[PDB]
């Protein structure tokens, strides 16, 4: 966790290019946006959660 | 003993190789 | 006391736990809760904590 | 041509050697003499051979082949050196020549083999080129051809009777030898898409059906598909059905399963919801060939306990009880839903009943904890309880609270079991009334009454302590009415010999209980109970052929073992 | 503050549904985990399996 925070601080400000891998953090909840591949969606059958 | 059978197989293979070499190259002195 | 109401007992126990945690070492919360003393007397002896 | 001639000669020697053993049968052969006769044809004895192509030991042939290589014509060079490598490797290639063969005499079998030979070849060709025509016209032609291939394979290896799934053992083993699974498996795991393709789904379903047919009743096919279990661990319905079908009546497989399968199915239940197929698979795996595995029951109980109430859905509270009451009415008639709602609950309770069987204390304690006897009696006593509920519910009650290593005294002192007996009498009367209409008889209720209703009573009364309970002394008329109802069921003319034997044994148990308690049974009942108490050569050739197959397998193993030094030389 | 507002809203909804006895098992799970989260929230600690 400490290493994650260190690299997050160090890499801050760099430009995002297409094909990069990113995470979305919801500021209101301080929770990341995740997709679960082992779980189906609520109102849709053959989607993911 | 398994070493005895291994030696028998090794000598059989060596004899086969020698006779095949003799057949192919021929009598060369 | 039946086995069929174990989750209900759990819910009531959790409610009384949050009540006790909320009233601890605080004057205003204790004053607020004490108004419901007449309500919360008659539930003693049912193992609802 | 020379290779085929060598194969023919060795097969002739092999059959000549077994000619003596055919009359001899005690049965063992002289492998050393056969090996010595076989090893002579290959050469290496230094007297040349007619099979030699130059009468000089191959010196001229070798000289020619090497001299056909330094030319600047690349096809010539390739052909020459391929001929070299084929020349130096004659004995081993003859060995793989044996490692392929097949076909004994019988009937149309002759043209069935020809029909099935090229079907697998074209299936392999289409699978290899599947990526070319897959959607990311040739496509429709490939679709129809593979559909016909799978249909033919399914309907050629199965002896389709009227209503019994009969499989031809010879056809199953012939398909095993050909290697049908070795292509169908790769057909299963081709890359495709699921959003916009449906004919692919039909082909996939046909492939699953054919695999289930290939393992229908054959132990060897199930054992061989057991190596590719890791490919079938999917939350899909078809994979679950296939794993069920390859595990039916397989005790040794069920005894040798890691916890990965059961844990994966429990997690599938937790994630993709409660489905009937998973519970049916658990029913199949827990008990096999009429024998229950203690380790299987222990691991499935640990799995369900770890899962918790997410999987174990119980309608115990009155709030859920009323929902169950109104949901039964929708469950009425032939309304299965084949997945959700109440049949899942039914299959779960048969699962618990089967897992509790065997006087397993570990399972019995958990089943007792999960469902109280008060809930059981409140469920059964309701008029809404249909026989579909009653069969499994009473089966679980009997299997958990009677057939126990450690007995519980609550079911020996309560008075609700007499209400249970009254309900059983009501069901017996309903069955007797239904006897008047054989054309539209309620078969489910009749089977319930004939088997379970007397089975629970017999299991309860078999214990010597049941007679010691003096609670029946005030309810003797109830006991005699129950005996009269059981005998009236015995009066029915639609009794299966299994059902008839069960009813007779239960009548005997009730009579023994009455004798022990000195109960004055009715004169007519006593009198009627006393009156009641008062292929030859073809099969041999086939077996000899199986022996021949095994013995030639041992023989070719022996030749490979003794030729590995010669091959390396 | 927002967590407190949301917890109050969901607790009120659960109470309204429970005073008529028309709740389901998933709602019971939700309210139980909500109450556990409330315990850990007021106490200031974090869940550790205890």
PDB file of N, CA and C in Angstrom, chain C residues 14-40:
ATOM      1  N   UNK C  14     -28.029  -5.822  17.813  1.00  0.00           N
ATOM      2  CA  UNK C  14     -27.211  -4.805  17.159  1.00  0.00           C
ATOM      3  C   UNK C  14     -27.774  -3.407  17.391  1.00  0.00           C
ATOM      4  N   UNK C  15     -29.101  -3.268  17.378  1.00  0.00           N
ATOM      5  CA  UNK C  15     -29.705  -1.969  17.655  1.00  0.00           C
ATOM      6  C   UNK C  15     -29.367  -1.495  19.063  1.00  0.00           C
ATOM      7  N   UNK C  16     -29.474  -2.384  20.047  1.00  0.00           N
ATOM      8  CA  UNK C  16     -29.150  -1.969  21.407  1.00  0.00           C
ATOM      9  C   UNK C  16     -27.655  -1.732  21.577  1.00  0.00           C
ATOM     10  N   UNK C  17     -26.824  -2.443  20.814  1.00  0.00           N
ATOM     11  CA  UNK C  17     -25.391  -2.173  20.826  1.00  0.00           C
ATOM     12  C   UNK C  17     -25.079  -0.778  20.293  1.00  0.00           C
ATOM     13  N   UNK C  18     -25.712  -0.378  19.185  1.00  0.00           N
ATOM     14  CA  UNK C  18     -25.452   0.964  18.668  1.00  0.00           C
ATOM     15  C   UNK C  18     -25.985   2.008  19.637  1.00  0.00           C
ATOM     16  N   UNK C  19     -27.110   1.722  20.299  1.00  0.00           N
ATOM     17  CA  UNK C  19     -27.615   2.642  21.314  1.00  0.00           C
ATOM     18  C   UNK C  19     -26.596   2.837  22.431  1.00  0.00           C
ATOM     19  N   UNK C  20     -26.064   1.730  22.958  1.00  0.00           N
ATOM     20  CA  UNK C  20     -25.106   1.813  24.056  1.00  0.00           C
ATOM     21  C   UNK C  20     -23.833   2.530  23.628  1.00  0.00           C
ATOM     22  N   UNK C  21     -23.353   2.255  22.414  1.00  0.00           N
ATOM     23  CA  UNK C  21     -22.161   2.936  21.921  1.00  0.00           C
ATOM     24  C   UNK C  21     -22.412   4.427  21.740  1.00  0.00           C
ATOM     25  N   UNK C  22     -23.627   4.795  21.332  1.00  0.00           N
ATOM     26  CA  UNK C  22     -23.930   6.198  21.083  1.00  0.00           C
ATOM     27  C   UNK C  22     -24.063   6.984  22.378  1.00  0.00           C
ATOM     28  N   UNK C  23     -24.603   6.367  23.429  1.00  0.00           N
ATOM     29  CA  UNK C  23     -24.795   7.108  24.672  1.00  0.00           C
ATOM     30  C   UNK C  23     -23.536   7.212  25.523  1.00  0.00           C
ATOM     31  N   UNK C  24     -22.465   6.507  25.168  1.00  0.00           N
ATOM     32  CA  UNK C  24     -21.302   6.424  26.042  1.00  0.00           C
ATOM     33  C   UNK C  24     -20.613   7.775  26.182  1.00  0.00           C
ATOM     34  N   UNK C  25     -20.259   8.117  27.425  1.00  0.00           N
ATOM     35  CA  UNK C  25     -19.503   9.312  27.804  1.00  0.00           C
ATOM     36  C   UNK C  25     -19.935  10.568  27.057  1.00  0.00           C
ATOM     37  N   UNK C  26     -21.233  10.709  26.807  1.00  0.00           N
ATOM     38  CA  UNK C  26     -21.759  11.880  26.121  1.00  0.00           C
ATOM     39  C   UNK C  26     -23.054  12.295  26.794  1.00  0.00           C
ATOM     40  N   UNK C  27     -23.191  13.593  27.059  1.00  0.00           N
ATOM     41  CA  UNK C  27     -24.329  14.092  27.820  1.00  0.00           C
ATOM     42  C   UNK C  27     -25.573  14.222  26.951  1.00  0.00           C
ATOM     43  N   UNK C  28     -25.434  14.840  25.776  1.00  0.00           N
ATOM     44  CA  UNK C  28     -26.597  15.096  24.932  1.00  0.00           C
ATOM     45  C   UNK C  28     -27.235  13.800  24.449  1.00  0.00           C
ATOM     46  N   UNK C  29     -26.420  12.820  24.054  1.00  0.00           N
ATOM     47  CA  UNK C  29     -26.970  11.542  23.614  1.00  0.00           C
ATOM     48  C   UNK C  29     -27.674  10.818  24.753  1.00  0.00           C
ATOM     49  N   UNK C  30     -27.101  10.859  25.959  1.00  0.00           N
ATOM     50  CA  UNK C  30     -27.749  10.225  27.104  1.00  0.00           C
ATOM     51  C   UNK C  30     -29.083  10.887  27.414  1.00  0.00           C
ATOM     52  N   UNK C  31     -29.130  12.219  27.349  1.00  0.00           N
ATOM     53  CA  UNK C  31     -30.389  12.924  27.553  1.00  0.00           C
ATOM     54  C   UNK C  31     -31.405  12.557  26.480  1.00  0.00           C
ATOM     55  N   UNK C  32     -30.956  12.444  25.229  1.00  0.00           N
ATOM     56  CA  UNK C  32     -31.855  12.073  24.141  1.00  0.00           C
ATOM     57  C   UNK C  32     -32.415  10.671  24.335  1.00  0.00           C
ATOM     58  N   UNK C  33     -31.564   9.723  24.729  1.00  0.00           N
ATOM     59  CA  UNK C  33     -32.002   8.339  24.876  1.00  0.00           C
ATOM     60  C   UNK C  33     -32.923   8.185  26.078  1.00  0.00           C
ATOM     61  N   UNK C  34     -32.640   8.902  27.170  1.00  0.00           N
ATOM     62  CA  UNK C  34     -33.416   8.733  28.394  1.00  0.00           C
ATOM     63  C   UNK C  34     -34.895   9.038  28.202  1.00  0.00           C
ATOM     64  N   UNK C  35     -35.254   9.805  27.171  1.00  0.00           N
ATOM     65  CA  UNK C  35     -36.664  10.049  26.888  1.00  0.00           C
ATOM     66  C   UNK C  35     -37.395   8.763  26.525  1.00  0.00           C
ATOM     67  N   UNK C  36     -36.676   7.774  25.990  1.00  0.00           N
ATOM     68  CA  UNK C  36     -37.253   6.501  25.579  1.00  0.00           C
ATOM     69  C   UNK C  36     -37.087   5.422  26.642  1.00  0.00           C
ATOM     70  N   UNK C  37     -36.843   5.829  27.890  1.00  0.00           N
ATOM     71  CA  UNK C  37     -36.655   4.868  28.971  1.00  0.00           C
ATOM     72  C   UNK C  37     -37.916   4.047  29.206  1.00  0.00           C
ATOM     73  N   UNK C  38     -39.081   4.696  29.184  1.00  0.00           N
ATOM     74  CA  UNK C  38     -40.325   3.966  29.362  1.00  0.00           C
ATOM     75  C   UNK C  38     -40.552   2.932  28.278  1.00  0.00           C
ATOM     76  N   UNK C  39     -40.181   3.263  27.039  1.00  0.00           N
ATOM     77  CA  UNK C  39     -40.249   2.283  25.962  1.00  0.00           C
ATOM     78  C   UNK C  39     -39.283   1.129  26.190  1.00  0.00           C
ATOM     79  N   UNK C  40     -38.038   1.434  26.541  1.00  0.00           N
ATOM     80  CA  UNK C  40     -37.002   0.411  26.561  1.00  0.00           C
ATOM     81  C   UNK C  40     -36.938  -0.365  27.870  1.00  0.00           C
TER      82      UNK C  40
END
